[PDB]
Amino acid sequence: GMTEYKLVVVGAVGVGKSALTIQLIQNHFVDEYDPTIEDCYRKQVVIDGETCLLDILDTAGQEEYSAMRDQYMRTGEGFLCVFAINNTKSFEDIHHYREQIKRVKDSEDVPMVLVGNKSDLPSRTVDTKQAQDLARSYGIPFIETSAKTRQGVDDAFYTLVREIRKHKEK
Ligand SMILES: Nc1nc2c(ncn2[C@@H]2O[C@H](COP(=O)(O)OP(=O)(O)O)[C@@H](O)[C@H]2O)c(=O)[nH]1
Ligand SMILES: *Sc1ccc(F)c(F)c1
Ligand SMILES: [Mg+2]
């Protein structure tokens, strides 16, 4: 089979995890997608000339059993840590997600990309400089996206694949 990357999209409810994922997969923007639905998507793409399969888990937070969260964190190779630029709490929540993924994988070397979504809105509580500072402290890229306009969306996902590649070649 073609090379396969397992990606997991995490972050506070309402930040745009579903909208980002559906924009990547189906190239349209979804105004309303039930906040409580968690689903694994598949999409064949070409990244740096490489035909590959993306398995993307669009997460929805708490699970029936915490075992289920741990399972997808161990399976996942890379994580999109998403906040919304007009939501400070969602930015603060990033610390929790960073910690929890490292904790479950018991690793200090977990491919991640920090994503500030909703960049199309003038309304902004988290400046680029603040987000850049956090990503720098993690040693990971920061990308601003808009699931609505599509800006930055392929970059967010493809960068995460490239981060996974760097980990795997070690
Ligand atoms: N303006 C704007 N709205 C967005 C963007 N991404 C998501 N939304 C809206 O934010 C709300 C929550 O998005 P959703 O994808 O369901 O967030 P999730 O809970 O993280 O899965 C929905 O009403 C979306 O239409 C974006 O990039 N720009
Ligand atoms: S689509 C998917 C399901 C589970 C998982 F851990 C992933 F990384 C992707
Ligand atoms: Mg959702």
Curated annotation (Swiss-Prot):
What is the name of the protein in this document? Answer: GTPase KRas
Q: What modulates its activity?
A: Alternates between an inactive form bound to GDP and an active form bound to GTP. Activated by a guanine nucleotide-exchange factor (GEF) and inactivated by a GTPase-activating protein (GAP). Interaction with SOS1 promotes exchange of bound GDP to GTP.
Residues the entry annotates as binding GTP:
11-19, 30-36, 60-61, 117-120
Q: Which disease is it linked to?
A: Leukemia, acute myelogenous: A subtype of acute leukemia, a cancer of the white blood cells. AML is a malignant disease of bone marrow characterized by maturational arrest of hematopoietic precursors at an early stage of development. Clonal expansion of myeloid blasts occurs in bone marrow, blood, and other tissue. Myelogenous leukemias develop from changes in cells that normally produce neutrophils, basophils, eosinophils and monocytes. Leukemia, juvenile myelomonocytic: An aggressive pediatric myelodysplastic syndrome/myeloproliferative disorder characterized by malignant transformation in the hematopoietic stem cell compartment with proliferation of differentiated progeny. Patients have splenomegaly, enlarged lymph nodes, rashes, and hemorrhages.
Q: Which residues carry this modification: N6-acetyllysine?
A: K105
Q: Which residues carry this modification: N-acetylmethionine?
A: M2
Name the protein family.
Answer: Belongs to the small GTPase superfamily. Ras family.
Pfam families recorded for this chain? Ras
Q: Which residues are glycosylated?
A: T36
- What is the enzyme's class at the highest EC level? hydrolase
Q: Which reaction does it catalyse?
A: GTP + H2O = GDP + phosphate + H(+)
PTM comment text = Acetylation at Lys-105 prevents interaction with guanine nucleotide exchange factors (GEFs). Lysine-depalmitoylation by SIRT2 promotes its localization to endomembranes in endocytic pathways.
Q: What is its main location?
A: membrane
Give the disulfide map.
none
Look up and give the organism this protein is from.
Homo sapiens
The reported result of mutating V15I is: In NS3; affects activity and impairs responsiveness to GTPase activating proteins; characterized by a strong increase of both intrinsic and guanine nucleotide exchanged factor-catalyzed nucleotide exchange leading to an increased level of the activated state
Motif (Effector region) positions are: 33-41
Has keyword Lyase?
Answer: no
Keyword vocabulary terms for this entry: Acetylation, Cardiomyopathy, Cell membrane, Cytoplasm, Deafness, Disease variant, Ectodermal dysplasia, Glycoprotein, GTP-binding, Hydrolase, Intellectual disability, Isopeptide bond, Lipoprotein, Membrane, Methylation, Nucleotide-binding, Palmitate, Prenylation, Proto-oncogene, Ubl conjugation
Query: What is this protein's function?
Result: Ras proteins bind GDP/GTP and possess intrinsic GTPase activity. Plays an important role in the regulation of cell proliferation. Plays a role in promoting oncogenic events by inducing transcriptional silencing of tumor suppressor genes (TSGs) in colorectal cancer (CRC) cells in a ZNF304-dependent manner.
Q: Where does the protein end up?
A: Cell membrane; Endomembrane system; Cytoplasm, Cytosol
GO molecular function terms here? G protein activity; GDP binding; GMP binding; GTP binding; GTPase activity; identical protein binding; LRR domain binding; protein-containing complex binding
Sorted alphabetically, which SUPFAM superfamilies does this protein's record hold? Answer: P-loop containing nucleoside triphosphate hydrolases
| Gene3D superfamilies, A to Z | P-loop containing nucleotide triphosphate hydrolases
